[PDB]
Design an enzyme around this catalytic site. Structure first.
Site, PDB file in Angstrom:
ATOM      1  N   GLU A 250      28.335   3.789  -2.883  1.00 34.22           N
ATOM      2  CA  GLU A 250      29.660   3.188  -2.703  1.00 34.22           C
ATOM      3  C   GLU A 250      29.789   2.733  -1.246  1.00 34.22           C
ATOM      4  O   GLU A 250      30.433   3.369  -0.406  1.00 34.22           O
ATOM      5  CB  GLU A 250      30.772   4.170  -3.066  1.00 34.22           C
ATOM      6  CG  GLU A 250      32.167   3.500  -3.186  1.00 34.22           C
ATOM      7  CD  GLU A 250      33.286   4.223  -2.405  1.00 34.22           C
ATOM      8  OE1 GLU A 250      32.990   5.151  -1.603  1.00 34.22           O
ATOM      9  OE2 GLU A 250      34.473   3.850  -2.588  1.00 34.22           O
TER      10      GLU A 250
ATOM     11  N   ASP B 134      29.543   9.040  -2.082  1.00 38.18           N
ATOM     12  CA  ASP B 134      30.900   8.640  -1.772  1.00 38.18           C
ATOM     13  C   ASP B 134      30.992   8.327  -0.285  1.00 38.18           C
ATOM     14  O   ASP B 134      30.695   9.190   0.550  1.00 38.18           O
ATOM     15  CB  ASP B 134      31.867   9.765  -2.156  1.00 38.18           C
ATOM     16  CG  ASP B 134      33.302   9.295  -2.251  1.00 38.18           C
ATOM     17  OD1 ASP B 134      33.567   8.374  -3.051  1.00 38.18           O
ATOM     18  OD2 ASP B 134      34.165   9.828  -1.523  1.00 38.18           O
TER      19      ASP B 134
ATOM     20  N   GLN C 149      41.220  16.089   4.053  1.00 38.08           N
ATOM     21  CA  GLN C 149      39.809  15.848   3.757  1.00 38.08           C
ATOM     22  C   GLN C 149      38.997  15.738   5.043  1.00 38.08           C
ATOM     23  O   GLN C 149      38.463  14.664   5.357  1.00 38.08           O
ATOM     24  CB  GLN C 149      39.666  14.562   2.942  1.00 38.08           C
ATOM     25  CG  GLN C 149      40.464  14.514   1.662  1.00 38.08           C
ATOM     26  CD  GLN C 149      40.319  13.193   0.944  1.00 38.08           C
ATOM     27  OE1 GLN C 149      41.042  12.243   1.236  1.00 38.08           O
ATOM     28  NE2 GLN C 149      39.378  13.121  -0.002  1.00 38.08           N
TER      29      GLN C 149
END
Ligand SMILES: [Ca+2]
Ligand SMILES: [Ca+2]
Ligand SMILES: [Mg+2]
Ligand SMILES: [Mg+2]
Lengths: 548, 548
Positions: free
Chosen positions: A246, A204, A172
């Site tokens: 978040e 995110d 990622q």
């Protein structure tokens, strides 16, 4: 007020909720057939985990195509039809815009790892979409988030022959936000889904956008500037949509992700500060932390609204508590080393509280009384269990348990053929725990949740009012008022497991007759002193109005 | 004190507890393997339902041999071993002595229906074992107990050409205790089992022994004198053995069955008077009726001890309450007409309370804290349900649910082939309500019952101490003290479905702190006035001690 202040969110994974075509994997048609369920639970807004094409090395947070739908989950027209049928039932729907990173297998990175130059000589546009280093020496002052799998925040790519940066898996790679061409791309990713009718985004891992040498590479100011830009976009181009942070940090840092009111950022942020204190307070039968951590939360801007939650699809995080508190929480809640991961505990709500329903109820009345909008993790309303034989947080993501039939009603495939296997152990399996059963039980936990959501819905104070802790005189009894309109509610919760007595300080409420929000059961009128005695049994919760 | 004043009783039927050989019927080999469970539950005496040869036209209460073991259930040797294995664990075992009547297939009645003289010509010793009449005219005062089934307590016998008396089914002819040869035979039957080691008996249907014209044929003086003779037998030949009586009458006539210290009768009687008033109190949210019927109970002798229960193998009986009281129990607790049988309600405890655990815990703590020895019905400790698709009270007698296997683990036989078919509906069936699940579940209703019998065992005031109600100033809350040796206990119980307040009268306890039996939490000291403010949630129970 805005719609999201009043909402009850419900957090599900398309892939583990309902399978429609028997392949063993949840999909959008399957989700669409279940929508009446969420309508009648009292849910207002679905929060969907990522649905994008992805090799699923972090279960879809490794996005490979920000503009599609993962084959497993249906086609784009399936999505469009589900979005239609959700809005036809008064359900808002929000996504996950995974901004910090993409899959290694995203076209951009497959193109970036070719180098700064293309084999002709001309520059490689996509090389600077990502964060490269020749040695990997930069940013050592930073913590590794996935401590149980990563050794460095730098990984050497074989082809590019140099180091790329990533705060999570090396699957990622981090995107490079000092490249305004990348800020373009995710404004454009957002517009793609906003134009389809989606009502908002959970964004995110927002604290980790911009890295800078000699800082912790979290919460930096330039990161907030990128995010103000997103709010500027949505306010101009799609008014009334949601932005939901978040941000998993300490409370002084978390309030930043709202932003001044003259230059706003997110509309809502998860209340990660209180989540661990709710559980800690329970084992210690001491609520001090709750009030102190609620204490360290400033006033937030007008448009702001906290998202209160107990659990979710990740582990119970412990990275923003004291070394001491963290040690306590492992001792109280991770007896087995298998229960730990990444500075955290990977168990669902019901097993953390020993499947004790008096405790589950207690923690859920607090979730719905504390100020904000409550979000529910799917399956926690029937009291679902964990499956720790599965690796890395998959244990809490098992398929929904609808009935006692094949794979609990999740699929017509056999549990072996399911993406994660349906739980069938004697305590929490779908033979004992499932929605059918609790729809036909007069007393089931499903019914109890729906009833308390009605009861919460019937008093706007719970969603919109202030908060004031009153002093009880016994730390096992937490008590506070919430005022809005004429209403003044009084919420008293006993965190100990035996009878407790307290002496509520209610001097401001002399003259007032407290009564019960269920059938206005009368209590002694608060008199003279203001100091009101109370006794409470095991894990009790008094929900009360102070007339007049 | 005698053993039965301390015991916890557990009622069960050998036929529906554990199959051993997979033939579909429970049997003493199967029961012996489950004594570990019963001991571990904290049970002290097993009370078994009748196990004799029979055609089971009343589940074996219609007996055709007093000194055998019904072959469904094993051999007489299987019974000896069971009895040996139960004692080896410190468990008493009492049987059922069906006294008033015998099956029509009993050798005696086969002989007795041949007439008063044989064909050869000598008198028939057996004809007078039963009550015959030529007209049916006699005892016109009496009421039919099986109101749904029998029109007359008199029934013509085809062969003897004259009517025979039965208080229950026509296939259960009444024995005749004006013949002393019948008193002889039942002393001998009683002896047969006591010689084998049985620790006593529940005697069935005691009020209806002797019939006299111009009375109700219940509770007669001559019925008590027969029974004084039974106590005398076991007093002499078998000191230690318990006599226990099923006397379903108003409180003054019930208390006669103990029978003064001068010439005693039974050691124990079922507290039939309180049971309806517990259920009725819960739905009025008004405990007054519990106090009123504890008042009208006269003091019982020194050997006497009440038997407290909530449910049993018969219907929740209402034959001895008001017309208004009965109308309220029917309306509140029998919404289907089907649930009515014989003046009363044929449902198990968990269905009666809407499967609500807070309520099941409430009543059970009241069972455990009211004076007496509490008797538990098999499987109400896991919350079993009922099966109305079975006739005549068999709905509450479905096989025990041990696990989620083939017939809930009661047999390898298919449930179609069980004596009664195991319950399988989505709420109460054995895929959800079973012992495996609850031994593994930390917070199961089974674990609760055990941890709550242990609390009882830890305080002899519950078994032996006195009883005194206190005034609470709110009929929803039921408080009493119990005092024995040092200990004064204080048991406060909320019968309402939402939080209540009350001002307890604790005047004779000023200077004294109540503390919690679990985890010794102390409360405010009782002071000055004595008038103690309290608040109580949904169906709370406070089990308190009073220092010092
Ligand atoms: Ca980054
Ligand atoms: Ca009789
Ligand atoms: Mg599928
Ligand atoms: Mg058998």
């Amino acid at each position: 007020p805005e719609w999201y202040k009043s909402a009850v969110f419900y957090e599900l994974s398309v892939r583990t909720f309902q399978d429609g075509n028997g392949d063993g994997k949840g999909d959008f048609p399957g989700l669409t057939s279940r929508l009446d369920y969420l309508k009648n639970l009292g849910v207002d807004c679905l929060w969907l985990l990522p649905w994008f094409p992805s090799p699923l090395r972090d279960d879809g947070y490794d996005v490979a195509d920000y503009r599609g739908i993962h084959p497993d989950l249906g086609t784009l027209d399936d999505f469009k039809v589900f979005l239609r049928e959700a809005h036809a039932r008064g359900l808002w729907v929000i996504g996950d815009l995974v901004t910090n990173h993409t899959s290694s297998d995203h076209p951009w990175f497959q193109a970036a790892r070719r180098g700064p130059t293309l084999p002709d000589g001309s520059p490689n546009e996509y090389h600077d979409y990502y964060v490269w280093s020749d040695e990997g020496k930069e940013y050592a002052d930073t913590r590794i988030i996935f401590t149980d799998t990563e050794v460095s925040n730098w990984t050497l790519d074989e082809q590019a022959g140099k180091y790329y940066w990533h705060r999570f898996f090396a699957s990622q790679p981090d995107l490079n936000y000092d490249n305004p061409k990348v800020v373009e791309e995710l404004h454009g990713a957002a517009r793609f889904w906003l134009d389809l009718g989606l009502d908002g985004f959970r964004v995110d891992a927002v604290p980790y956008l911009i890295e800078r040498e000699g800082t912790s590479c979290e919460n930096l100011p330039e990161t907030h500037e990128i995010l103000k830009g997103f709010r500027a976009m949505v306010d101009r181009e799609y008014p009334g949509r949601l932005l939901l942070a978040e941000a998993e940090q300490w409370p002084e840092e978390v309030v930043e992700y709202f932003g001044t009111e003259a230059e706003p950022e997110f509309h809502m942020c998860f209340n990660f500060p209180v989540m661990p204190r709710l559980y800690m307070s329970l084992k210690r039968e001491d609520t001090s932390s709750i009030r102190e951590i609620m204490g360290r939360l400033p006033k937030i801007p007008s448009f702001g609204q906290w998202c209160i939650f107990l659990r979710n699809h990740d582990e119970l995080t412990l990275e923003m508590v004291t070394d001491d508190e963290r040690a306590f929480m492992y001792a109280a809640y991770a007896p087995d080393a298998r229960m730990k991961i990444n500075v955290g505990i990977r168990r669902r709500l019901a097993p953390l509280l020993d499947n004790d329903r008096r405790r589950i109820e207690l923690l859920n009345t607090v979730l719905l009384a504390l100020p904000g909008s409550p979000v529910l993790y799917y399956g926690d309303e029937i009291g679902m269990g964990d499956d720790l034989g599965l690796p890395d947080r998959n244990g809490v993501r098992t398929p929904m348990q609808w009935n006692a039939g094949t794979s609990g009603g999740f699929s017509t495939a056999q549990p072996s053929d399911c993406f994660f296997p349906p739980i069938q152990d004697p305590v929490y399996g779908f033979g004992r725990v499932n929605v059918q059963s609790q729809l036909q039980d007069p007393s089931s936990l499903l019914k109890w949740t729906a009833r308390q959501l009605e009861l919460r819905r019937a008093h706007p104070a719970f969603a919109h009012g202030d908060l004031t802790f009153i002093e009880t005189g016994n730390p096992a009894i937490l008590a506070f008022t919430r005022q809005y309109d004429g209403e003044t509610l009084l919420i008293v919760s006993n965190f100990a497991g035996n009878a407790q007595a307290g002496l509520l300080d209610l001097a401001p409420f002399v003259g007032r007759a407290p009564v019960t929000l269920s059938g206005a059961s009368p209590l002694p009128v608060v008199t003279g002193n203001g100091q009101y005695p109370v006794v409470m049994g095991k894990y009790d919760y008094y929900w009360l109005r102070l007339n007049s």
